[model samples]
Target chain A: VMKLIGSHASPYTRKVRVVLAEKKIDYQFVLEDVWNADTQIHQFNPLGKVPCLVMDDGGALFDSRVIAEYADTLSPVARLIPPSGRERVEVRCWEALADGLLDAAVALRVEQTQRTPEQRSESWITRQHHKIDEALKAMSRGLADRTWCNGNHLTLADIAVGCALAYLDFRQPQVDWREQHANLAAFYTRIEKRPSFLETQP
Target chain B: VMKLIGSHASPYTRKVRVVLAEKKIDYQFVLEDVWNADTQIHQFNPLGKVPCLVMDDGGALFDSRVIAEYADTLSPVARLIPPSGRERVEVRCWEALADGLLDAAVALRVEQTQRTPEQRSESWITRQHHKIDEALKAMSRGLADRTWCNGNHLTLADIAVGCALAYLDFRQPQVDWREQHANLAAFYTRIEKRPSFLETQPQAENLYFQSH
Candidate 1:
């Protein structure tokens, strides 16, 4: 069996887990403390980031976006992305937007949690917050009236968006994302019920 | 026909420009001051980043990676990426690696340039530098002596790697990348001679598009 190297808390890891579950792809979840002094993650993924899927042949795939897309092609149980063309581009862009939002959120989380008070920059935090806010608005506009971010069916875009929203909820509970974007709130309400999402909650 | 919303100095934007030129795709360069208070970049890319391709129908594609992939399918002149299978995965992964390297470098750039000296965190800067160095090593290992990042021909992977190395040169000349990695140095020397790279030099002044 393939091994998934990542942590439970990472939204990126969660995204892959959800996708794998959706695809009915089975793999061993090898929890990795990416920040540990003796971390072996570098052996597989040189970027030293998470959600790396080590294939059965010792081959490795990484960075959540790549892993998620690759996993979809494996089983074909659930087609999370279109094979090609305009529809495919929109789904990818949505995934990018959602992942971008999480990037800002994770950066903000690191700023608040990892750094000392003196080491923390208010302006940097502000910038990340601004990015998060802007991304949320973009997501809200993108998800205006759709059940999923792209087409009617669920896709990687929806999974990515759900993970981002859930990450915000986990880290920034104070963030009133639900109040400002009703469409997003409704969208979240719609997807959070899935078995894939339920099993992979952070 | 189409417009590319970006700046001359942005590495991600440069990757797209190089691709468009290679594909013989005609698109107007619309320089955007993403940092400006009234910049219109958000209208196209909600992320407010660059290398946004506004298609003829007024629909916009963005964040460089997507646009690069989309552009490859435009005229099919130069097949920058493989259609599917393990080959395509390798190419995309190489592109991702190069893009990730730039992401760290850009983050470091912003931290140093945008923040006041007092507001700067040594650890943050160090972290970015560490990421840059790690990424450089990864690129070196991935490149090995292949002549290109992936496969035999010049793909988006090669373009992305070239743009990243050039951006590092543009921003961090102190980096002795040549002394450290001869393969990368030779690779850059090879790609820098291309007309597409020659035409879109970062040293050139950014031209603004008022009409949008």
Candidate 2:
């Protein structure tokens, strides 16, 4: 069986976990704290980040987006990405947007929590907030009453956005995105109820 | 024709430009200084980053990796990515590694150049440097004695790595990776002469902080 190295706290990890669950693929969940000084993430992923998927052959795949897409192909059930063409790009775009939002949200969180008060830059924090706000707006506009992020079905796009929104709720509850983007909030409410999502909430 | 919004100084942008050149896809290169307050990058990419490919219909693709992969499919002139299966994953992995290295190098550059002297953190700088070192080591190991990053023929993997090495030379000259990784140095030496890479070398951008 393949092994997935990740922590529950990472939305990137949650995105891949939800992908595997939705596809009904089985794997060993090797929980790892990437922040720990003795973390073994470097053995699997040189970048030292989470959501590294170790295949049965001992080859590792990483960086969430690559792993999630690759995992979808391992089983034909519940396809999360289109095989090709424009719809495929659209699904990937949704994934990128959500991932980008999560990137900004995570950056802001790290700035606030990890840095010394004297070392942190308020301008950087503000820049991240702006990125989050704009990404939320774009995601809302893209959703705009659609049942899913793309083509009336659940793809990696929805999974990614679900994880992103969950991360925002986990790390930046003060942002109150629900009040601002009703479309995204509604989408999140719907996707949050999925077994894949419910089981992997960060 | 599609439009690619980016600056000449961005490695991410250079990656796409080299892909387009290799694929023989024509695009209107719209020079964009993303740091400018008046820049309109947000109209396309929500991330407000460079290498945004605006299609003929005005639909946009972004974040370099997405655009570069998508551009490969536009024409069959030079197939950069495999159609599917393990080889495809390998190519994407190489791109990710190269892009990750650039991400760390850029972060370190920004930390040193963009921040105030009092605001700079040695720990963060050290963290980025560590990431860069590990990534380069992995890339070297992955390449070993291969002529290209993946497979016998050139792929987006090579282009991505080529752009990465050039950016290291451009921004982080102190890295001196050539002295450490002989295999990567040989690969970069060969790839640097390609017309695709030659035409898209990252030039100096005077108007903004140059870190991609």
Candidate 3:
């Protein structure tokens, strides 16, 4: 049996979970508080972060992207990524952009809410906000009139972009991203209707 | 024809360049100082970062790791990553650790040297150093007695870990890492002699993107 370890609220963890559900793979899920001293995350992942996919042989995969790619290969469902070549790179780029946006939002959250007031740096928070804003604009532009990030099909691009959008809505209620990017809101609405999205929503 | 745009000094760019070299793929290298406002990076990458791999079709692939994976698929050279399953993920995990260490080093460099003294945060620099310190220790432990990150095979894991070590040499010279992690130092020494590493070596102090 496989095992997945992460907190419920992590967008990255949600990504792997959604992929597993979509692929119809089952695994043991371990809840972790990454900040807690007892998490023992380092034993599994050298980066000391969550969403580490523990394989049947006890080997662990650290990245959600890696896990998703590996899982997509295991199941015969509609491929979440292009098999190869230029099209595949473009899809992965969308994943990268979405991950970058998530990074900015996560950093913003950590700085603004997790830190003591005096320990926080306004410049860092401001930089993260700028990244988040630019990322949303880029995502909207990339989507354009297409139904998904890569076109009409649902791919890892769509999954990551949807997860990132959901993350912002979950954590940044005051940001009001929908007011600026209606295309995004529409896409989010579309993806959330999927059972995988509904089950994995944090 | 493929083109790569980024400073040679950048660890991220260097990682891609090293992979290209190792795979023996030919691509034009376009140098860019990402800090310069005129770099026009945003036209290619939404993140406005360097090491953007522009395909002949004008599509852009980015953020180092993606570029490495894409490039490895094109060549018949020694496989830079395991084919699939647990082994592949383990290789990727090593790559992740290498990238994370580079992130720490970059954050440290940016906070210490890029910012003005009044704007600098000692706490931030200290936090970054702690991360770097722990990451190096973790990497050393993972490497153990293996010849390469994945047991005798020179995968993308080695290329990434090697570049991180070289970047530390190029950027953080004062930090003595070899004394504690002699194994890692030996591994770096082994990889650096490769034509790929020698060819992509930074020209002393010119850099733009962080490897992570």
Model 1, residue B39: C-alpha shift (Å): 2.5
**What are the chain A TM-scores for all the models, listed individually?**
0.97, 0.97, 0.97
TM-score of 2: 0.96
Considering only N, C-alpha and C atoms within 3 Å, which residue pairs clash in candidate 3?
A: B12-B211
* lDDT by residue (tens digit), candidate 2, B1-212: 99999988899999999999999999999998777779999998888888899988888887788888788888979789998998999998888889889989988777876679998888778777887888899999999998998889999999988998999999999998999999999999999999988777775455444556
lDDT of 1 at B47: 71
Per model, the share of native interface contacts recovered reads 0.52, 0.66, 0.47
Which candidate number has the best lDDT? 2
Q: What ordering of candidates by TM-score runs from best to worst?
A: 2, 1, 3
Error of 2 at A37 (Å): 3.2
Per-candidate interface DockQ score: 0.60, 0.76, 0.47
Off by over 4 Å in 2: B204-212
lDDT for model 1, please.
0.87
Give the TM-score of each candidate.
0.94, 0.96, 0.88
Model 2, A114-188: lDDT tens digits are 668998888788778888989999899888988898887899989999999999999998999999998887888
In candidate 1, stretches whose alpha carbon ends up further than 4 angstroms from where it belongs are A36-38, B206-212
CAPRI band for model 2: medium
